[PDB]
Amino acid sequence: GDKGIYRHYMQKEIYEQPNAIKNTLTGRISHGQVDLSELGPNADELLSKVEHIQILACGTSYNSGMVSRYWFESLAGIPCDVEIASEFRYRKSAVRRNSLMITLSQSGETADTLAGLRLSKELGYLGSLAICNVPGSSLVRESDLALMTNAGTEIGVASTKAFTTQLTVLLMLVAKLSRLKGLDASIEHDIVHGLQALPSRIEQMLSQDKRIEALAEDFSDKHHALFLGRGDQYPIALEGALKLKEISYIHAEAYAAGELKHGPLALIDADMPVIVVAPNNELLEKLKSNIEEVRARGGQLYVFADQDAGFVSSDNMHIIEMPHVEEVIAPIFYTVPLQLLAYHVALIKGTDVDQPR
Template sequence: MCGIVGAVAQRNITPILIEGLLRLEYRGYDSAGVAVLAEGNGIQRVRAVGKVIELQNALQATPATGHLGIAHTRWATHGKPAEHNAHPHMSGKLAIVHNGIIENHSPLRKKLIELGYQFTSETDTEVVAHLIAHYYSESHDLLDAFRTALGELHGAYALALMHEDQPETLYCARMGSPLVIGQGSDEHYIGSDPLALLQVTDRFRYLEEGDHARLTINTCEIWDRDNLSVDRPLTRYEHAAHSLEKGEYRHYMLKEIFEQPQAIRDTLAGIVGDDHVLTAILGPDAETRLVDIANIHIVACGTSYHAGLVARYWIEDQAGIPCTVEVASEYRYRTVVVPDNTLLITISQSGETADTLAALRFAKDQGYLATLAICNVAGSSLVREADWRLLTHAGPEIGVASTKAFTTQLVALLWLTTALAQVRGKPADQIAANVKALKDLPAIIEQALTLEPRITTLAERFANKHHALFLGRGTHYPIAMEGALKLKEISYIHAEAYAAGELKHGPLALVDEDMPVVSVAPSDALLEKLKSNLEEVRARGGQLITFACETIDQTNDSNHEIINLPFVEGCISPILYTIPLQLLSYHVALVKGTDVDKPRNLAKSVTVE
């Protein structure tokens, strides 16, 4: 959620830094600051609580100009929102900004205090500043000191560093949090997001995990985690693919479906370690308060409600915490019994969904332990009013039918499930497996997206259909619900979803040769029972379409088409199986000739009851 901008140039870079911070305002923050190395005056630092406009006002009162500088917007994790906790942080002649979380900041702080360093903030970032300063005082080599300090840091970080002794040099590093290097004409820049720098360049080098770099006006040196010199390619920013335009895609919905791998990477950036999750992203007291949670209530609407239903399976199975999920429009109008130590989770893409926001406000007086908002919009009402926030970083979603917002919500909820299991002392290998599965997920989704040509052909079978059934079991039952919702929303085909075991209790009466039946069949403990349910459909002449794990031994026939998906670990399987259902609904809508991005009677953000 924090933002970094840095620059080294032959001109005054303060306007570049401020404009970069303004372009990062979408990320959400509580304070901002800038440090500029002014010729003859040393480092000038200006910080302010609140929005960037407050920093601009402070700069008018105390101007700071120079050719080298760093700037930052902060979302408090360690230490309350306050000027003394705002970045940049300094140690003598050194200034630093930081995104992420340093997990071992406490022992490092103790060590540095014993060495005589004094702290003026509660942040983990000031620890890094003093640590580098300490090693520099011993080696008198800033690059060596930077590397030595990086070797002691545990957690996730993107760092930018400058020192008065090197007035034309900017240092940076990344591990678990994104950072890019922008190249101009006799200028170099850094940013936590390329969007922050598009006013000055569209040429970027993307740092990889463990990289660190040294930049001057006309040189860029990059080393990997083993201190070996590497060349990261200079690439031109693809404006169309990342802006609010459709670019090469026919509709926003299709563009947003294909943006999901990157949206998931962005959501995970800075919140997972090598084999665990970084709970401090929720706040400095998060770990203690997470341990206290004895019950969970999830409240949401539409697609976000389906995400909550998947999370219920995860939370109860992996964390052992009772969890209920409710539609916000029902929750807010009934008498709610809140057990002791209950966490309320609200989920919304926009953060302005009227029923969900009203539910959060209603819950304020119901005795909840805490409230958590999972949302895609940092400055939204839901995010501002909840005790904790977990942003999904899906980027702008223009299509009314939610796609990347849904999958990133699931990623955030699986992260939260893993955090709850972690603080409860669940097996370390379970935690590590979840983290690995989350990190592997973007590449697996990219594989699933290659199924589009086959799904395009499959969609033709819906040309004259008016009804469809979707079936799933376990965590994939809510995914079937989401698939049915997508088909309804944009193709106007009446679609219903059922837990497959419920077929014989009524829905089987609808099955005939004119009723497509879509099922999701991962390789899990419920597979054999699902196969029996599908045989009930085949016996009555139903036309089956099954998205199945590639390890399942099934073959296509005249009334059963099988589309294989890669085998994945069970926890991320529901996210993977969402992808073909999104593609199916999109291509059926094309066949039907409907307005894909703006389906009739629907709005993107439902801000009224």
């Protein structure tokens, strides 16, 4: 691994997400449909039994699992639950009928997640599927099925392309399951259409990078931050805050935007930066109401908003205008500006963004 033109490996890994996602899609999209034949000819038999999906993960992989739950329920109609592995492995849980256990890990050796999989064997799940970046790892070996993310090696201190490539795999599995259930073929068609557009969409907003870098300067004297999102963007806010905290040591936390009135609002003042992801969807007007709560309360707003969402930059509201994006890939797309934000704030504070050597 050489940095090329990039100044840091984390920078390289964020900017290379278009190529990373195309690597994730290779051989898995054929004639406008999802092709998961790598799973073998025994997969469909199992997968079409599935009536429930249990996801186990931690950290950034838990956040990606949380996004996919919205997809599985809304697009594939399959009940889905996501749990932190360290809590699942020690608690007596209820049996869901015909449940598929999905594990998300980048290394495939994450102890609590692997411990959770080794417990699922004894509780009678239908089967297990590992979504992982390392072939031959324990989670892959010990799972019934496995789908590699093809993200390559990360040298940044936190995962960037590893998160978006997991989401990409999860979204392909949504499309495959939607077909296995006999749902309308248009669902798979629209998912595949969005995934095919996502690399170019990410390339489009990377042009906004130096805007994010300048706005990051506002974080120079701060050590708190608040991230807001709604719907399938709430886990993107959670991931944004995790990134900022892991890489910059800012006390960053995330809330579902419709819940500000339970604590956060009282602490919001002129010294609190509030970061919001605002796609142009059915939740936008409600989100604007939540954004106004923060604005009228003095918060310093940094809003990553679709370019036709109608926001106006004022003194305490800074708008980063995002290109249009297909709604099904919007959570993957809106993660990228938050990665850039954490990267730039980390460097401003003088913190390392790359692993030693």
